[PDB]
Ligand binder design. Structure first.
Ligand SMILES: Nc1ncnc2c1ncn2[C@@H]1O[C@H](C[C@@H](N)CC[C@H](N)C(=O)O)[C@@H](O)[C@H]1O
Length: 327
């Protein structure tokens, strides 16, 4: 169902495809700009539904493996210009060994991975890494093919990395933070647990990818940008805009988790944003009246952006309200 290399209309690290053009449906244009992200792998009918709900736009499928050392396959529905995109610099390390230098010295020659799988919320238990330890410990390299297959399967499944001889480990949160393009300690401290760190990171945007798409906005909004960020999580979008050097004037962030909200608030302060950050807890508390007053108070929204959430319906309802209001 998906393209041969998932580079969308193009990725910075490879040659542009032969086709980099898109003609936006007439209704799909106009302010505001919108950016919707969903899992790439999904039945035909779902993406059909999403497209029909979002002004007939066809999704742009891209794998974040072209932006970092971990794969992430996503479909992005948007109405942004597609040309003159530039990446965040410097480019993220794109192999496990580049990203995690301490992992290279203990990487067995028989482990061919140079790229991690999609980063998820759950982590490999001590029990499993123990099983792997005992499975490889008996041999002083290399282990029988069937055990090689057993441990390679477990490692791929759980994104385990080598940290010593006979020792694999799940990624620690700082490693995940950097793989996703977040500043270090972005999710550390302040009342969030470790497992919740993994859950908030596992559900986030890959920042380099998103920034590559949003980079076209930098010239358009020198006054600063007003953003409706829906299901904003730990603020992947805001961090992308920030790393792009796009000033943020007003951000309306709708996020159910208090832990996520606090993470984003801390970040907002730490980066000394002069602009305004406004939090709402439920996407269902943004009615036409609330949107109206937000807009008459702060000006219209330049970008509305949301990620992988009836909640999609909430996104659509809200985007439609905003576009209606703005004309
Ligand atoms: N009803 C809701 N209203 C607003 N946010 C929700 C709601 N339900 C779940 N969420 C938040 O949805 C975010 C949707 C995630 N895919 C977001 C990841 C986020 N975009 C990031 O880049 O970090 C999470 O914070 C979900 O917990």
């Amino acid at each position: 169902r998906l393209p041969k290399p998932m580079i969308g209309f193009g990725v910075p690290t490879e040659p542009l495809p032969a086709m980099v053009r898109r003609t936006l449906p007439s209704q799909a244009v106009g302010p505001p700009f919108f950016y919707y992200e969903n899992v790439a792998l999904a039945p035909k009918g779902v993406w059909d539904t999403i497209s029909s709900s979002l002004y007939d736009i066809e999704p742009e499928f891209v794998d974040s493996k072209y932006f970092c050392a971990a794969a992430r396959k996503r479909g992005y529905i948007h109405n942004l210009p597609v040309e003159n995109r530039f990446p965040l610099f410097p480019l993220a390390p794109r192999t496990i060994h580049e990203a995690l230098p301490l992992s290279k010295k203990w990487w067995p020659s028989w482990d061919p991975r140079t790229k991690l799988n999609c980063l998820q919320t759950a982590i490999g238990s001590a029990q499993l890494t123990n099983r792997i330890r005992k499975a490889v410990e008996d041999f002083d390299g290399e282990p029988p093919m069937r055990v090689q297959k057993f441990v390679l399967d477990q490692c791929r499944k759980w994104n385990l990395v080598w940290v010593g001889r006979n020792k694999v480990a799940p990624l620690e949160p700082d490693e995940v933070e950097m793989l996703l393009g977040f500043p270090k300690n972005h999710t550390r401290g302040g009342g969030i647990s470790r497992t919740d760190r993994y859950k908030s990171l596992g559900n986030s945007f890959q920042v380099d990818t998103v920034a590559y798409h949003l980079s076209v906005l930098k010239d358009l909004f020198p006054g600063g940008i007003n953003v409706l960020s829906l299901f904003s999580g730990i603020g992947g979008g805001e961090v992308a805009l920030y790393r792009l050097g796009i000033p943020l004037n007003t951000v309306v962030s709708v996020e159910k988790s208090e832990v996520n909200r606090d993470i984003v608030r801390s970040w907002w302060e730490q980066t000394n944003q002069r602009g305004n950050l406004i939090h709402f807890n439920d996407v269902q508390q943004l009615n036409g009246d609330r949107l109206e007053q937000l807009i008459e108070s702060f000006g219209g929204f330049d970008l509305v952006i949301g990620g992988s959430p009836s909640l999609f319906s909430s996104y659509v309802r809200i985007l439609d309200l905003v576009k209606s209001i703005m004309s």
